[PDB]
Structure formats: C-alpha cells, structure tokens
Design a binder for this molecule. Structure first.
Ligand code: GLU
Lengths: 132, 32
C-alpha cells in the first residue's frame, strides 16, 4: 500500500489498483483579491427614471393652480418658491399674502418632509463598491 | 432595493385631494 495524497488517474489505474475514493480532487485557479469599484449611481439609486419625469408633472401643473387662485384673491416668481421648498429650503423666498394659497402651500410643503424619507435611510447602504 | 413608481401610491392622492378639496373652500371663502 501507498497511503497518502494519491490522485486516481487513468494511466495509473492500469498497472495498479485503487480503493474507493473518500475525498474529492480536481483543478482550481487562485488569484489575489481585487479592488472593488462603484459605478456612478444613476441619480443615487432612487425610484427609477419614472419618478424623475413624474415630479416634473404635478409640480408644473400645481403651480398653474396657484396662479389661477392668485389673481382672484407673478408666475415667474411662483416657480422659485414652490419648487425650491423640496430641497432643504434655504434659498431666498417671496411668499404671497393670499389666504387660499397660504393653506395650499403648507399641504404641498408637508410633501417635502415625506420626500426626504425616500432619499434618506435607503441611500446609506447602497453607495459602496459593488459588482465584485 | 428600488422604491420605484409603485409602493408609494398613498401619498399621491394627498396632493390631488387637496386640489380637489381646495377649490370647494375658496368659493365659501370668496362669499365670506
Ligand atoms: N498527489 C497527487 C497530485 C500530484 C501531486 O501532488 O504532485 C498525485 O499523486 O497524483
């Protein structure tokens, strides 16, 4: 007997005999670790390109609603405040004195509070190098 | 994980509902 690390083959099994194998053996390839990479995240992995076209829809059709109720009691100045509120409101503002729109914007304003939840929490983990 | 268009439907009618409800109050406000 020749006990040890002997690999069953075709030529060897002709002139000698082998017992029942008890361990697998094959051929494998080893390469050192590679540095990971992160592709530039398309809008930081949000809610599909649909939402980006989606936000343009209601925002542009809700500013006109305010303009309609503005005269009854400046659309160019009515797009600066309405939009910029959604992104960490810090820019200079110009707010109308219309009572009907005053209540309306607050409901719109509350949307920005909930919007951040979509762009927070989730974005933390999915930013590091991936794809292996 | 992708938020996608779905799984966020509830907040949608809140913007729309305010528009629908808001036009009802202004008529009372104008008459007030
Ligand atoms: N030990 C195995 C693999 C060859 C080697 O380890 O050099 C054999 O006897 O065939």
């Amino acid at each position: 007997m020749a006990i040890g690390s002997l690999t069953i083959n075709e030529e060897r099994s002709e002139i000698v005999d082998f017992s029942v194998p008890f361990v697998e053996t094959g051929i494998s390839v080893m390469v050192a670790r590679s540095n990971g990479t992160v592709s530039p995240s398309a809008f930081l992995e949000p809610y599909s390109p649909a939402v980006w076209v989606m936000m343009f829809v209601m925002c542009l059709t809700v500013v006109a609603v305010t303009v309609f109720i503005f005269e009854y009691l400046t659309i160019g100045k009515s797009i600066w405040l309405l939009w910029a509120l959604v992104f960490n409101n810090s820019v200079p503002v110009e707010n109308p004195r219309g009572t009907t729109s005053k209540i309306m914007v607050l409901v719109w304003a509350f949307f920005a509070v909930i919007f951040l939840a979509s762009y927070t929490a989730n974005l933390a983990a999915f930013m590091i190098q991936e794809e292996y | 994980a992708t938020l996608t268009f779905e799984n966020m439907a509830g907040v949608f009618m809140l913007v729309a509902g305010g528009i629908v409800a808001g036009i009802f109050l202004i008529f009372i406000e104008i008459a007030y």
